[PDB]
Protein backbone atom coordinates (compact mmCIF):
# COMPACT_ATOMS: atom_id res chain seq x y z
CA UNK A 1 0.00 0.00 0.00
CA UNK A 2 1.78 3.04 -1.38
CA UNK A 3 1.46 5.52 1.49
CA UNK A 4 0.22 8.98 0.49
CA UNK A 5 2.00 11.62 2.60
CA UNK A 6 5.83 11.41 2.73
CA UNK A 7 8.86 13.69 3.22
CA UNK A 8 10.67 15.70 0.47
CA UNK A 9 12.40 19.06 -0.14
CA UNK A 10 9.73 21.59 0.87
CA UNK A 11 11.69 24.85 0.91
CA UNK A 12 9.02 27.58 1.08
CA UNK A 13 5.35 26.71 1.57
CA UNK A 14 4.82 28.80 4.71
CA UNK A 15 1.71 30.89 5.31
CA UNK A 16 1.66 34.11 7.31
CA UNK A 17 -1.60 35.12 8.98
CA UNK A 18 -2.30 38.44 10.73
CA UNK A 19 -5.72 37.41 12.00
CA UNK A 20 -6.60 40.06 14.55
CA UNK A 21 -4.81 43.27 15.56
CA UNK A 22 -1.18 42.21 15.25
CA UNK A 23 -1.83 38.50 15.91
CA UNK A 24 0.84 37.02 13.66
CA UNK A 25 0.96 33.25 13.27
CA UNK A 26 2.07 30.91 10.53
CA UNK A 27 1.38 27.46 9.09
CA UNK A 28 3.77 25.23 7.16
CA UNK A 29 1.13 23.88 4.76
CA UNK A 30 2.85 20.51 4.04
CA UNK A 31 3.32 19.68 7.71
CA UNK A 32 -0.27 20.65 8.50
CA UNK A 33 -1.72 18.17 6.09
CA UNK A 34 0.92 15.47 6.68
CA UNK A 35 -0.05 15.51 10.37
CA UNK A 36 -3.77 15.59 9.63
CA UNK A 37 -3.47 12.66 7.23
CA UNK A 38 -1.99 10.48 9.93
CA UNK A 39 -4.57 11.85 12.38
CA UNK A 40 -7.24 10.40 10.11
CA UNK A 41 -5.32 7.13 9.71
CA UNK A 42 -5.07 6.79 13.51
CA UNK A 43 -8.78 7.35 14.07
CA UNK A 44 -9.95 5.14 11.19
CA UNK A 45 -7.69 2.43 12.65
CA UNK A 46 -8.97 2.51 16.24
CA UNK A 47 -12.57 2.83 15.03
CA UNK A 48 -12.21 -0.11 12.60
CA UNK A 49 -12.84 -2.70 15.33
CA UNK A 50 -15.66 -2.76 17.89
CA UNK A 51 -13.32 -3.14 20.91
CA UNK A 52 -10.60 -0.53 20.15
CA UNK A 53 -13.12 2.31 20.09
CA UNK A 54 -12.38 3.24 23.66
CA UNK A 55 -8.85 4.50 22.94
CA UNK A 56 -10.34 7.65 21.36
CA UNK A 57 -9.19 9.49 24.51
CA UNK A 58 -5.70 8.00 24.32
CA UNK A 59 -5.29 8.97 20.66
CA UNK A 60 -6.40 12.53 21.37
CA UNK A 61 -3.89 12.51 24.21
CA UNK A 62 -1.06 11.46 21.90
CA UNK A 63 -1.90 13.88 19.07
CA UNK A 64 -2.28 16.85 21.43
CA UNK A 65 1.08 16.04 22.92
CA UNK A 66 2.60 16.04 19.47
CA UNK A 67 1.02 19.39 18.81
CA UNK A 68 2.42 20.77 22.03
CA UNK A 69 5.81 19.48 20.93
CA UNK A 70 5.39 20.96 17.48
CA UNK A 71 4.27 24.26 18.92
CA UNK A 72 7.35 24.31 21.14
CA UNK A 73 9.46 24.38 18.01
CA UNK A 74 7.43 27.21 16.58
CA UNK A 75 7.59 29.08 19.86
CA UNK A 76 11.39 29.07 19.49
CA UNK A 77 10.99 31.81 16.89
CA UNK A 78 8.44 34.03 18.68
CA UNK A 79 11.04 36.77 19.19
CA UNK A 80 11.70 37.18 15.48
CA UNK A 81 7.95 37.05 14.98
CA UNK A 82 7.38 39.84 17.48
CA UNK A 83 10.19 41.70 15.73
CA UNK A 84 8.16 41.55 12.54
CA UNK A 85 4.88 42.48 14.26
CA UNK A 86 6.29 45.81 15.41
CA UNK A 87 7.58 46.49 11.91
CA UNK A 88 4.15 45.85 10.47
CA UNK A 89 2.82 48.00 13.31
CA UNK A 90 4.98 50.83 11.99
CA UNK A 91 3.86 50.28 8.37
CA UNK A 92 0.09 49.97 8.90
CA UNK A 93 -0.07 52.90 11.35
CA UNK A 94 2.07 55.77 10.13
CA UNK A 95 1.37 58.06 13.11
CA UNK A 96 9.44 62.00 9.02
CA UNK A 97 10.62 58.55 7.88
CA UNK A 98 9.90 57.15 4.40
CA UNK A 99 8.42 54.09 2.70
CA UNK A 100 11.93 53.13 1.51
CA UNK A 101 13.38 52.61 5.00
CA UNK A 102 10.13 51.01 6.18
CA UNK A 103 9.62 48.67 3.22
CA UNK A 104 13.21 47.43 3.28
CA UNK A 105 12.90 46.95 7.05
CA UNK A 106 9.76 44.86 6.58
CA UNK A 107 11.37 42.64 3.94
CA UNK A 108 14.42 41.97 6.12
CA UNK A 109 12.41 41.02 9.21
CA UNK A 110 10.22 38.75 7.04
CA UNK A 111 13.20 36.98 5.47
CA UNK A 112 14.73 36.63 8.95
CA UNK A 113 11.63 34.82 10.21
CA UNK A 114 11.62 32.47 7.20
CA UNK A 115 15.33 31.76 7.78
CA UNK A 116 14.55 30.86 11.39
CA UNK A 117 11.95 28.36 10.19
CA UNK A 118 14.45 26.87 7.73
CA UNK A 119 17.02 26.36 10.49
CA UNK A 120 14.49 24.43 12.62
CA UNK A 121 13.13 22.20 9.82
CA UNK A 122 14.88 19.07 11.14
CA UNK A 123 13.18 19.53 14.53
CA UNK A 124 9.79 19.78 12.78
CA UNK A 125 10.58 16.75 10.63
CA UNK A 126 11.23 14.63 13.70
CA UNK A 127 7.79 15.38 15.21
CA UNK A 128 6.10 14.66 11.88
CA UNK A 129 8.00 11.37 11.60
CA UNK A 130 6.86 10.48 15.14
CA UNK A 131 3.26 10.96 14.01
CA UNK A 132 3.75 8.89 10.86
CA UNK A 133 5.29 6.08 12.94
CA UNK A 134 2.48 6.10 15.52
CA UNK A 135 -0.30 6.17 12.92
CA UNK A 136 1.22 3.63 10.56
CA UNK A 137 1.96 1.35 13.51
CA UNK A 138 -1.74 1.41 14.41
CA UNK A 139 -2.64 0.94 10.72
CA UNK A 140 -0.24 -1.96 10.11
CA UNK A 141 -1.81 -3.85 13.05
CA UNK A 142 -5.28 -3.35 11.50
CA UNK A 143 -6.94 -6.78 11.58
CA UNK A 144 -10.24 -8.05 10.21
CA UNK A 145 -12.95 -10.43 11.34
CA UNK A 146 -12.76 -12.23 7.99
CA UNK A 147 -10.08 -10.83 5.68
CA UNK A 148 -12.27 -11.26 2.60
CA UNK A 149 -15.31 -9.47 4.18
CA UNK A 150 -14.10 -6.34 6.00
CA UNK A 151 -16.83 -4.09 7.42
CA UNK A 152 -16.81 -0.46 6.27
CA UNK A 153 -18.71 0.91 9.26
CA UNK A 154 -15.35 2.21 10.49
CA UNK A 155 -15.31 4.57 7.50
CA UNK A 156 -18.96 5.45 8.04
CA UNK A 157 -18.40 6.27 11.70
CA UNK A 158 -15.21 8.24 11.02
CA UNK A 159 -16.86 10.28 8.27
CA UNK A 160 -20.06 10.88 10.26
CA UNK A 161 -18.26 12.11 13.39
CA UNK A 162 -15.15 13.72 11.87
CA UNK A 163 -16.00 14.97 8.40
CA UNK A 164 -19.75 15.35 7.70
CA UNK A 165 -20.36 18.33 9.98
CA UNK A 166 -17.74 20.19 7.99
CA UNK A 167 -19.01 19.36 4.51
CA UNK A 168 -22.34 20.82 5.61
CA UNK A 169 -20.68 23.80 7.33
CA UNK A 170 -18.73 24.54 4.13
CA UNK A 171 -21.83 24.53 1.95
CA UNK A 172 -23.58 26.75 4.58
CA UNK A 173 -21.49 29.92 4.04
CA UNK A 174 -21.50 30.02 0.20
CA UNK A 175 -17.73 30.29 -0.30
CA UNK A 176 -17.85 32.01 -3.66
CA UNK A 177 -20.11 34.83 -2.56
CA UNK A 178 -17.51 35.70 0.05
CA UNK A 179 -15.06 36.18 -2.85
CA UNK A 180 -17.45 38.19 -5.03
CA UNK A 181 -17.84 40.57 -2.10
CA UNK A 182 -14.08 40.65 -1.50
CA UNK A 183 -13.55 41.67 -5.13
CA UNK A 184 -16.29 44.27 -4.73
CA UNK A 185 -14.44 45.79 -1.75
CA UNK A 186 -11.13 45.82 -3.65
CA UNK A 187 -12.70 47.51 -6.68
CA UNK A 188 -14.30 50.10 -4.43
CA UNK A 189 -10.97 50.88 -2.75
CA UNK A 190 -9.31 51.32 -6.15
CA UNK A 191 -11.97 53.85 -7.14
CA UNK A 192 -12.11 55.63 -3.78
CA UNK A 193 -8.34 55.97 -3.72
CA UNK A 194 -8.17 57.46 -7.22
CA UNK A 195 -11.34 59.54 -6.78
CA UNK A 196 -9.69 60.96 -3.64
CA UNK A 197 -6.11 61.55 -4.92
CA UNK A 198 -6.15 65.18 -6.04
CA UNK A 199 -2.96 66.51 -4.41
CA UNK A 200 0.30 66.11 -2.52
CA UNK A 201 1.17 66.73 1.12
CA UNK A 202 -1.25 64.14 2.45
CA UNK A 203 1.00 61.44 0.94
CA UNK A 204 2.43 59.08 3.52
CA UNK A 205 -1.06 57.61 3.72
CA UNK A 206 -1.49 57.21 -0.03
CA UNK A 207 1.60 54.98 0.08
CA UNK A 208 0.35 52.94 3.03
CA UNK A 209 -3.16 52.59 1.59
CA UNK A 210 -1.71 51.22 -1.63
CA UNK A 211 0.43 48.79 0.38
CA UNK A 212 -2.61 47.52 2.32
CA UNK A 213 -4.56 47.20 -0.94
CA UNK A 214 -1.78 45.04 -2.38
CA UNK A 215 -1.48 42.78 0.67
CA UNK A 216 -5.28 42.44 0.63
CA UNK A 217 -5.21 41.22 -2.95
CA UNK A 218 -2.44 38.76 -2.11
CA UNK A 219 -4.60 37.38 0.70
CA UNK A 220 -7.54 37.33 -1.72
CA UNK A 221 -5.60 35.26 -4.29
CA UNK A 222 -4.95 32.73 -1.58
CA UNK A 223 -8.57 32.50 -0.37
CA UNK A 224 -9.44 32.12 -4.08
CA UNK A 225 -7.09 29.14 -4.44
CA UNK A 226 -8.21 27.45 -1.22
CA UNK A 227 -11.91 27.88 -1.98
CA UNK A 228 -11.19 26.23 -5.33
CA UNK A 229 -9.73 23.17 -3.62
CA UNK A 230 -12.52 23.08 -1.02
CA UNK A 231 -15.11 23.15 -3.81
CA UNK A 232 -13.59 20.26 -5.74
CA UNK A 233 -12.70 18.16 -2.66
CA UNK A 234 -16.21 18.47 -1.19
CA UNK A 235 -17.53 16.89 -4.39
CA UNK A 236 -14.84 14.20 -4.62
CA UNK A 237 -15.32 13.37 -0.92
CA UNK A 238 -19.08 12.94 -1.26
CA UNK A 239 -18.66 11.03 -4.54
CA UNK A 240 -16.17 8.53 -3.07
CA UNK A 241 -17.81 8.16 0.37
CA UNK A 242 -20.90 6.82 -1.44
CA UNK A 243 -18.84 3.82 -2.66
CA UNK A 244 -17.01 2.83 0.58
CA UNK A 245 -19.93 2.98 3.06
CA UNK A 246 -22.57 0.20 2.85
CA UNK A 247 -20.59 -2.88 1.80
CA UNK A 248 -17.47 -4.96 2.43
CA UNK A 249 -13.97 -5.18 0.96
CA UNK A 250 -11.06 -7.57 1.01
CA UNK A 251 -8.42 -6.37 3.49
CA UNK A 252 -6.11 -5.03 0.76
CA UNK A 253 -8.91 -2.99 -0.85
CA UNK A 254 -10.17 -1.78 2.54
CA UNK A 255 -6.71 -0.45 3.44
CA UNK A 256 -6.20 1.16 0.02
CA UNK A 257 -9.65 2.75 0.41
CA UNK A 258 -8.84 4.13 3.87
CA UNK A 259 -5.63 5.70 2.57
CA UNK A 260 -7.49 7.29 -0.36
CA UNK A 261 -10.22 8.74 1.87
CA UNK A 262 -7.66 10.01 4.41
CA UNK A 263 -5.74 11.77 1.62
CA UNK A 264 -8.93 13.49 0.44
CA UNK A 265 -9.94 14.59 3.95
CA UNK A 266 -6.44 15.71 4.94
CA UNK A 267 -6.32 18.09 2.00
CA UNK A 268 -9.90 19.36 2.37
CA UNK A 269 -9.40 20.13 6.06
CA UNK A 270 -6.03 21.82 5.52
CA UNK A 271 -7.17 24.35 2.94
CA UNK A 272 -10.47 24.94 4.78
CA UNK A 273 -8.53 25.87 7.93
CA UNK A 274 -6.35 28.28 5.98
CA UNK A 275 -9.27 29.66 3.99
CA UNK A 276 -10.88 30.83 7.21
CA UNK A 277 -7.67 32.22 8.70
CA UNK A 278 -7.00 34.31 5.58
CA UNK A 279 -10.58 35.51 5.58
CA UNK A 280 -9.82 36.78 9.09
CA UNK A 281 -6.72 38.65 7.93
CA UNK A 282 -8.50 40.14 4.91
CA UNK A 283 -11.07 41.83 7.04
CA UNK A 284 -8.59 42.83 9.75
CA UNK A 285 -6.76 44.81 7.06
CA UNK A 286 -10.09 46.09 5.69
CA UNK A 287 -11.08 47.58 9.04
CA UNK A 288 -7.70 49.26 9.16
CA UNK A 289 -8.36 50.74 5.72
CA UNK A 290 -11.42 52.52 7.08
CA UNK A 291 -9.24 54.22 9.73
CA UNK A 292 -6.50 55.30 7.34
CA UNK A 293 -9.00 56.64 4.80
CA UNK A 294 -10.72 58.61 7.52
CA UNK A 295 -7.39 60.05 8.69
CA UNK A 296 -6.55 60.99 5.09
CA UNK A 297 -9.64 63.22 4.88
CA UNK A 298 -8.36 65.28 7.81
CA UNK A 299 -5.15 66.39 6.07
CA UNK A 300 -7.28 66.65 2.94
CA UNK A 301 -8.85 69.95 4.02
CA UNK A 302 -5.73 70.93 6.05
CA UNK A 303 -3.71 71.44 2.90
CA UNK A 304 -7.08 72.23 1.26
Amino acid at each position, epitope marked *: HFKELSNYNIANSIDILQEKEGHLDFVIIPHYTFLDYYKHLSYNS*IYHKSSTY*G*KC*I*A*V*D*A*FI*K*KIN*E*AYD*K*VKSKCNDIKNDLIATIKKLEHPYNRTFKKMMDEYNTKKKKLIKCIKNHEN*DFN*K*ICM*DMKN*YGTN*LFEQLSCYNNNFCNTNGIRYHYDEYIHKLILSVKSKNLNKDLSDMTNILQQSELLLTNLNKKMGSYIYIDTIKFIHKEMKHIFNRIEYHTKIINDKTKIIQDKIKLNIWRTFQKDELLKRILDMSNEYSLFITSDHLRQMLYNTFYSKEKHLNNIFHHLIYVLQMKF
Partner: antibody
Amino acid sequence: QVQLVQSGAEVKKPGASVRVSCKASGYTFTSYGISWVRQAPGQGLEWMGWISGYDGNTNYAQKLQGRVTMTTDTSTSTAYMELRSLRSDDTAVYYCARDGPQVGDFDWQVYYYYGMDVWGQGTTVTVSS
Amino acid sequence: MTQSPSTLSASVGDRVTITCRASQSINTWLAWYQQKPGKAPNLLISKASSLESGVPSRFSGSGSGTEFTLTISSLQPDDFATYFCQQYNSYLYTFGQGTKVEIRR
Protein backbone atom coordinates in the same frame (compact mmCIF):
# COMPACT_ATOMS: atom_id res chain seq x y z
CA GLN B 1 2.03 27.53 28.98
CA VAL B 2 1.42 23.90 30.00
CA GLN B 3 2.09 23.61 33.73
CA LEU B 4 0.97 22.04 37.02
CA VAL B 5 0.77 24.20 40.17
CA GLN B 6 0.86 22.60 43.64
CA SER B 7 -0.08 23.92 47.09
CA GLY B 8 2.45 25.25 49.62
CA ALA B 9 4.50 23.45 52.30
CA GLU B 10 2.56 21.75 55.09
CA VAL B 11 3.43 20.66 58.68
CA LYS B 12 1.26 17.94 60.25
CA LYS B 13 1.15 15.86 63.46
CA PRO B 14 1.10 12.04 63.36
CA GLY B 15 -2.42 10.70 62.94
CA ALA B 16 -3.67 13.77 61.05
CA SER B 17 -4.43 14.02 57.33
CA VAL B 18 -3.09 16.19 54.52
CA ARG B 19 -4.60 17.38 51.23
CA VAL B 20 -2.41 18.53 48.34
CA SER B 21 -3.78 20.10 45.17
CA CYS B 22 -2.35 20.10 41.66
CA LYS B 23 -3.96 22.66 39.34
CA ALA B 24 -3.43 22.03 35.61
CA SER B 25 -3.03 24.86 33.13
CA GLY B 26 -2.43 25.35 29.41
CA TYR B 27 -3.77 21.93 28.36
CA THR B 28 -6.93 19.83 28.27
CA PHE B 29 -7.07 18.32 31.76
CA THR B 30 -9.80 15.84 30.79
CA SER B 31 -7.59 14.26 28.13
CA TYR B 32 -4.68 13.47 30.46
CA GLY B 33 -3.97 11.67 33.73
CA ILE B 34 -2.24 12.79 36.91
CA SER B 35 0.27 10.67 38.84
CA TRP B 36 1.48 11.31 42.38
CA VAL B 37 5.09 10.47 43.38
CA ARG B 38 6.93 11.24 46.64
CA GLN B 39 10.63 11.68 47.45
CA ALA B 40 11.93 11.19 50.97
CA PRO B 41 14.83 13.47 51.97
CA GLY B 42 18.01 12.57 50.11
CA GLN B 43 16.36 9.41 48.72
CA GLY B 44 14.92 8.22 45.43
CA LEU B 45 11.38 8.58 44.11
CA GLU B 46 8.37 6.46 45.11
CA TRP B 47 5.23 6.33 42.96
CA MET B 48 2.07 6.79 45.04
CA GLY B 49 -0.86 6.59 42.66
CA TRP B 50 -2.59 7.77 39.53
CA ILE B 51 -6.03 9.03 38.48
CA SER B 52 -7.49 9.64 35.00
CA GLY B 53 -8.95 13.06 34.32
CA TYR B 54 -11.27 11.44 31.74
CA ASP B 55 -12.33 8.10 33.24
CA GLY B 56 -11.70 8.78 36.92
CA ASN B 57 -10.33 5.27 37.38
CA THR B 58 -7.50 5.01 39.90
CA ASN B 59 -4.36 2.97 40.62
CA TYR B 60 -2.83 3.05 44.13
CA ALA B 61 0.39 1.59 45.45
CA GLN B 62 -0.22 -1.38 47.77
CA LYS B 63 1.83 0.20 50.59
CA LEU B 64 -0.42 3.29 50.67
CA GLN B 65 -3.65 1.33 50.02
CA GLY B 66 -6.57 2.44 52.22
CA ARG B 67 -4.79 5.58 53.48
CA VAL B 68 -4.55 7.54 50.22
CA THR B 69 -7.35 8.85 48.04
CA MET B 70 -6.98 10.83 44.83
CA THR B 71 -9.81 12.88 43.42
CA THR B 72 -10.39 15.15 40.46
CA ASP B 73 -12.43 18.27 39.67
CA THR B 74 -12.93 18.42 35.90
CA SER B 75 -14.65 21.81 36.30
CA THR B 76 -11.64 23.57 37.85
CA SER B 77 -9.05 21.28 36.20
CA THR B 78 -7.64 20.30 39.57
CA ALA B 79 -6.39 16.99 40.94
CA TYR B 80 -6.27 16.36 44.67
CA MET B 81 -4.45 13.80 46.76
CA GLU B 82 -5.29 13.14 50.40
CA LEU B 83 -3.15 11.07 52.75
CA ARG B 84 -4.74 10.17 56.09
CA SER B 85 -3.32 8.64 59.27
CA LEU B 86 0.00 10.42 58.70
CA ARG B 87 3.14 8.80 60.10
CA SER B 88 6.71 10.05 60.66
CA ASP B 89 8.04 8.16 57.63
CA ASP B 90 5.65 10.14 55.39
CA THR B 91 7.90 13.22 55.66
CA ALA B 92 8.76 13.87 52.01
CA VAL B 93 8.40 16.06 48.92
CA TYR B 94 5.19 15.28 46.99
CA TYR B 95 4.94 15.75 43.18
CA CYS B 96 2.09 15.57 40.65
CA ALA B 97 2.77 14.85 36.97
CA ARG B 98 0.81 14.68 33.71
CA ASP B 99 0.42 11.15 32.36
CA GLY B 100 -1.89 8.86 30.39
CA PRO B 101 -5.67 8.92 30.71
CA GLN B 102 -5.77 5.10 30.91
CA VAL B 103 -2.72 3.76 32.76
CA GLY B 104 -4.04 0.74 34.64
CA ASP B 105 -5.96 -0.05 31.46
CA PHE B 106 -7.10 -3.36 29.94
CA ASP B 107 -4.62 -4.60 27.35
CA TRP B 108 -2.05 -2.37 25.62
CA GLN B 109 -1.63 1.13 27.04
CA VAL B 110 0.53 1.60 23.93
CA TYR B 111 -1.42 4.53 22.44
CA TYR B 112 0.78 6.56 24.80
CA TYR B 113 4.48 5.94 24.06
CA TYR B 114 5.60 8.81 26.33
CA GLY B 115 4.78 9.02 30.03
CA MET B 116 5.35 11.78 32.64
CA ASP B 117 6.27 14.88 30.59
CA VAL B 118 5.08 17.73 32.92
CA TRP B 119 5.70 18.09 36.68
CA GLY B 120 4.45 20.26 39.53
CA GLN B 121 6.90 22.25 41.65
CA GLY B 122 6.48 19.84 44.60
CA THR B 123 5.04 20.19 48.10
CA THR B 124 7.08 19.57 51.24
CA VAL B 125 5.15 17.70 53.94
CA THR B 126 6.73 17.40 57.40
CA VAL B 127 5.28 14.93 59.92
CA SER B 128 6.27 15.50 63.55
CA SER B 129 4.45 15.72 66.88
CA MET C 1 15.29 -0.78 39.68
CA THR C 2 18.93 -1.81 39.16
CA GLN C 3 21.36 1.09 38.77
CA SER C 4 24.93 0.14 37.84
CA PRO C 5 26.84 3.19 39.20
CA SER C 6 25.52 4.29 42.60
CA THR C 7 27.84 7.32 42.59
CA LEU C 8 29.62 8.06 39.31
CA SER C 9 32.69 10.29 39.03
CA ALA C 10 33.12 11.70 35.52
CA SER C 11 34.68 14.60 33.62
CA VAL C 12 33.31 17.37 31.41
CA GLY C 13 33.45 16.18 27.81
CA ASP C 14 33.49 12.48 28.70
CA ARG C 15 31.03 9.95 27.27
CA VAL C 16 28.82 8.74 30.13
CA THR C 17 26.82 5.50 30.06
CA ILE C 18 24.39 4.52 32.83
CA THR C 19 22.66 1.14 32.64
CA CYS C 20 19.27 0.36 34.22
CA ARG C 21 18.65 -3.35 34.68
CA ALA C 22 15.24 -4.69 35.69
CA SER C 23 13.53 -7.50 37.59
CA GLN C 24 11.42 -9.21 34.93
CA SER C 25 11.06 -8.27 31.26
CA ILE C 26 9.54 -5.02 30.05
CA ASN C 27 8.57 -5.07 26.37
CA THR C 28 10.04 -1.63 25.70
CA TRP C 29 8.83 0.63 28.55
CA LEU C 30 11.48 2.60 30.41
CA ALA C 31 11.51 6.35 31.09
CA TRP C 32 14.60 8.41 31.89
CA TYR C 33 14.47 11.52 34.10
CA GLN C 34 17.05 14.11 35.17
CA GLN C 35 16.87 15.75 38.60
CA LYS C 36 18.85 18.82 39.88
CA PRO C 37 18.86 19.91 43.54
CA GLY C 38 15.73 21.72 44.65
CA LYS C 39 14.02 21.07 41.31
CA ALA C 40 11.49 18.54 40.02
CA PRO C 41 12.52 15.73 37.66
CA ASN C 42 12.57 16.36 33.91
CA LEU C 43 11.67 13.67 31.37
CA LEU C 44 14.70 13.03 29.18
CA ILE C 45 13.66 9.86 27.34
CA SER C 46 10.56 7.71 26.81
CA LYS C 47 9.94 4.27 25.25
CA ALA C 48 13.12 3.07 23.46
CA SER C 49 15.19 6.14 22.55
CA SER C 50 12.51 8.78 21.85
CA LEU C 51 14.06 11.67 23.74
CA GLU C 52 11.29 14.23 24.09
CA SER C 53 11.67 17.59 22.37
CA GLY C 54 13.86 20.17 24.05
CA VAL C 55 16.16 17.36 25.21
CA PRO C 56 19.63 18.01 23.68
CA SER C 57 20.90 15.78 20.87
CA ARG C 58 23.51 14.24 23.20
CA PHE C 59 21.14 12.14 25.34
CA SER C 60 20.54 8.73 23.74
CA GLY C 61 18.51 5.74 24.94
CA SER C 62 18.64 2.00 24.36
CA GLY C 63 17.36 -1.43 25.30
CA SER C 64 14.28 -3.56 24.68
CA GLY C 65 13.91 -6.07 27.54
CA THR C 66 15.63 -6.23 30.93
CA GLU C 67 18.79 -4.24 30.09
CA PHE C 68 18.61 -0.59 28.96
CA THR C 69 21.10 2.29 29.05
CA LEU C 70 21.23 6.09 28.94
CA THR C 71 24.21 7.56 27.06
CA ILE C 72 25.37 11.17 27.24
CA SER C 73 27.69 11.55 24.26
CA SER C 74 29.65 14.43 25.81
CA LEU C 75 29.03 15.51 29.40
CA GLN C 76 28.29 19.24 29.61
CA PRO C 77 28.83 21.51 32.64
CA ASP C 78 25.05 21.63 33.21
CA ASP C 79 24.58 17.83 33.25
CA PHE C 80 25.89 17.07 36.76
CA ALA C 81 22.65 15.87 38.35
CA THR C 82 21.09 12.54 39.33
CA TYR C 83 19.35 10.29 36.82
CA PHE C 84 16.29 8.08 37.24
CA CYS C 85 14.74 5.23 35.28
CA GLN C 86 11.04 4.34 35.45
CA GLN C 87 9.72 0.93 34.40
CA TYR C 88 6.06 1.07 33.34
CA ASN C 89 4.69 -2.38 32.59
CA SER C 90 2.05 -3.11 35.23
CA TYR C 91 -0.44 -0.58 36.58
CA LEU C 92 2.02 0.04 39.43
CA TYR C 93 5.10 2.07 38.49
CA THR C 94 8.59 1.35 39.82
CA PHE C 95 11.17 4.10 40.34
CA GLY C 96 14.71 2.76 40.53
CA GLN C 97 16.86 4.67 43.01
CA GLY C 98 18.77 7.44 41.32
CA THR C 99 22.29 7.65 39.91
CA LYS C 100 24.39 10.67 40.91
CA VAL C 101 26.93 12.03 38.41
CA GLU C 102 29.67 14.33 39.70
CA ILE C 103 32.96 15.61 38.33
CA ARG C 104 36.14 13.66 39.12
CA ARG C 105 39.39 15.36 40.15
